[PDB]
Design a protein around this nucleic acid. Sequence first.
RNA 1: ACUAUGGUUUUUAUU
RNA 2: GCGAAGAACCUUACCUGGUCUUGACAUCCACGGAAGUUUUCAGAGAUGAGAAUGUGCCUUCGGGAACCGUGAGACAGGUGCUGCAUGGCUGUCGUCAGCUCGUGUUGUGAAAUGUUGGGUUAAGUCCCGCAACGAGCGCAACCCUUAUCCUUUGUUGCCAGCGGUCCGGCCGGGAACUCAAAGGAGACUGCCAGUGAUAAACUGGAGGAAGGUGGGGAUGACGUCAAGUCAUCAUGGCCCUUACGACCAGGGCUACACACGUGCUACAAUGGCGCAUACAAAGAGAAGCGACCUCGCGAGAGCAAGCGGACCUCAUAAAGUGCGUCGUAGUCCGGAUUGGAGUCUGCAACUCGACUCCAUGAAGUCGGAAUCGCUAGUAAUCGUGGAUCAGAAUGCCACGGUG
Lengths: 79, 64, 100, 150, 206, 98
Amino acid sequence: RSLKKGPFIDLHLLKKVEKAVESGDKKPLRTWSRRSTIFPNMIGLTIAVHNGRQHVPVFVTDEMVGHKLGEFAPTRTYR
Amino acid sequence: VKGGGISGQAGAIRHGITRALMEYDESLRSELRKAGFVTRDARQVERKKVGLRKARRRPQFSKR
Amino acid sequence: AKQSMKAREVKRVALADKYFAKRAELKAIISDVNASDEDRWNAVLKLQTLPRDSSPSRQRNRCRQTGRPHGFLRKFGLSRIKVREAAMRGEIPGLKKASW
Amino acid sequence: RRRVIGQRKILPDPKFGSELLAKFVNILMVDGKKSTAESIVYSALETLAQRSGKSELEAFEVALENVRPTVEVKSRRVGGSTYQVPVEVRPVRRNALAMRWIVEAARKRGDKSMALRLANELSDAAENKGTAVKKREDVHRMAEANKAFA
Amino acid sequence: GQKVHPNGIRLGIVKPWNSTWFANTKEFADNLDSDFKVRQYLTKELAKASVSRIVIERPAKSIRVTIHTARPGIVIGKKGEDVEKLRKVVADIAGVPAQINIAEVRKPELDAKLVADSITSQLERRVMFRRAMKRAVQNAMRLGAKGIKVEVSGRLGGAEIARTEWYREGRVPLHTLRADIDYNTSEAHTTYGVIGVKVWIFKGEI
Amino acid sequence: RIRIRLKAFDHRLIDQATAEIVETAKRTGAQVRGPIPLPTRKERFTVLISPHVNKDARDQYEIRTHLRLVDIVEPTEKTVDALMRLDLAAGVDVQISL
RNA sequence: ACUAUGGUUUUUAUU
RNA sequence: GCGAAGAACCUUACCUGGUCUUGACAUCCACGGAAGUUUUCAGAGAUGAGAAUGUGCCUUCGGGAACCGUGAGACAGGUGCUGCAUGGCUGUCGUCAGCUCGUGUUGUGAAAUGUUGGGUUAAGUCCCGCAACGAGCGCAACCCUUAUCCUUUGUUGCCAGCGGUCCGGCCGGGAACUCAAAGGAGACUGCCAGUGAUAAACUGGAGGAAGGUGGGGAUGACGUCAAGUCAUCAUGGCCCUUACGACCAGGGCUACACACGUGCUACAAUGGCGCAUACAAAGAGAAGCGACCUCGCGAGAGCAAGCGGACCUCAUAAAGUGCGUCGUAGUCCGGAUUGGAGUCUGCAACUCGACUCCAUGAAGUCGGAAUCGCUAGUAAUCGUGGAUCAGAAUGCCACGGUG
């Protein structure tokens, strides 16, 4: 029941996963678009997302997949 | 009669009657003047100052 | 008001000239409540999903003598803080103050 | 101050020729519709003959000759200070003051039909009990213990 | 203190506009924007050609301009043909072919713009500042009129304050709506300042 | 048949143009009636006319568009050729119609 | 039957 | 509720991370290209690299110029600081009756006099009078406009007169209450009474459509508030000028553990609802407003006329009038919140849009000390329209009904 039968998507972040699973102990993969959807094959990865003044880490779970990335991260201050 | 509301039509008809009724007999010509029915009533705009909300109320004023 | 706001809008109107100008009803040959679920008009959609810098939004009329967006009077191209000057300086036909 | 004003005495009712009935429908006028009020007051006698109303010569006079208001209360300044002082009711509101005391008592009552609430309020004035008749008495009993100022 | 533009408050008494053309409700904002910039550009091209006032008209998909000058011979110029380059660019900022007309001013030192360049050219040539106006007034009342006011601001001391000087002759007039005046405001930019000048000329009611 | 859409923003400018086109028609021998004046069309607004806030300073302005049609009923051609290239008072617009 | 408490600085003289 | 009347990317004053600064805007000089149109690929994207499409203008036939995309040198530009510096631009004491000067007089003199006094006015307005007599600015008068009659020109508005009578202003035709337009008269305290130095001047009356600064517009004498604004401009000073430049992918400006205004609508039964039933007025609208017709309970989407202004569209005017019915139950009233299913414009409908229908429906007893506003077509009450406006305010500017 999402807006139109066709979803609006870009594969620009999905194309990074097969390299982000070999990063070692380096700081997580960083992104700025928050309207982006999270596909089921993105599960088990740490991503750094913009909170409005810095970037903070989130881990992809069975609750985050099939939804947008911005729905799982903070957007405001006083916390 | 045509145009206006029925209370406005009464304002047209009541003087259209006297413009005929004063010819109907010489003994009515003084009597309709003694009652004030042979003349146009003195009402005319009366339209709001620039800009009052609706006729009056200086919109959110109440000042002093 | 930064001078880029109008200098970019004139370039976007020139770009709408291939996508929307006499083409804003062109969706009327691809819109349908069902269409038997077939596909035969995607030749239109390939070009309606192509532009990003041209859109039915992102425009502000402004004043033709000041970059300010608000206080504007469309049919003169001037502002509510410019027409009372122009109508006393004699710079505009049809418009006058007082008498009447 | 200046003025000295023009005043209005209003048109009579178009069925009965009564200007007292005209002032009653004006005090009964809400939302400016004015034709609605004609259908609420003097629109039945069968609802007054249901309670205390005896013969049609009293079907409206129970709000007119049945009472005489004289004073209103509140405070007034005399010299450098303010005191509670009964003031002399004006001679043309004299006969139209109890109209509000009946219309308010019926309008604010929770008992459905407004045409029947008004006929029941007129019946409760025809017995000379409680509403409107005690709003006359309360201020007269006050003014019988307050006489030094006018 | 309360005040209004003295020609613009009188414009509602039978006078035409100096921008006098027609346009449709959607093209009007564009036809007005071209009217402003031809009046600007042309009065700058002629800034040393003794010009007073301008009037804009529109023939069928063309533009027509009349300019008033006290030296028509230098505006029509070399062989009486040196006008093509003076219509050439007003046609390029109006988007339509341009047409020229020149008008002669026949009592020049009685025009509200040319008397203001005359007193500018006396303040430039270092006359007594608080007395400069008496020459321009004498020379104007020699040409016609019922009354005149020309007001100077700056360099009138003594102390350097908001002082203004003009002197009384006939009527200004401060009001009379049908006064049928001639009006202008100018700045001389002389004497290390701006030296603000204003002039009102009265010839009689309507 | 011909009509001539003569339009202006001033009630005297259109009378001073009528006094040129209808006189040219009569002097060129055209068979013509009294031309209709038409109901006036208006544009109006009330706006805040002060340069920065001062909320009391709201004032009303209006402008009026006048139109006449002239209307020639007769099919005669030579009598009306004198109108189509004729000069009228500055600021009026003309368009020819049926 | 009456309210203590908000300091301090300003201009025309020339022809 | 004032501007800031329209905050998803935007707009927009700014932050995270990118990227490029003779720059958004103007020429002089320099190089390969017409201006322009498309397609393939990397990058968050801006953008960058290939391959096609076309070869305009001038052509002393010499080869050249607009212009594109860029690089110099002159230069750009600033919600950078500032309305006790100045123009501009707008307000207020204030359309108030205020403000002074010459001659003559007076006082040692600064300075007074007139301008105070009497009767008055819209008013230093007008008459009367003295050691004052006269003059001017503001005022008065004069201006734009309104109620009414006479006279004239008329449409696809109107139908009186006079003809036809698809029986309909639908036509011949016309200018009759009207309507749309114009022209001429009309008002002056002049006319009459009462009052008062039969002075000035006032309240009524007669005429008349109607006065007595009629009502509405509209001008601003010296003096005020160093009035308001550099976030709308010009221009000097101070500052910047690879930056405070400003384009991308995210986004900010609906903050918030916290105090307070102001406004709207109910609580019902002079109410709620349906059917029957009557009158609008002013606006707006050509890739527009969109009729009749269709699918769906519907948002809305199709079919397909009319209309650029009085033969159309938006658009059966509503409150009201008539009739039946529910009836204190914290109620089919009346409203917050909510599940499911749909309708729409848009890169985009997370954060962060509007609209419709089933399913669920909490409060609400007409408000207490106290405080706020309106004087007649004024209060109150119901409906129509538009600007801003992809799509989205209840705010706002106008037009009518009831009273």
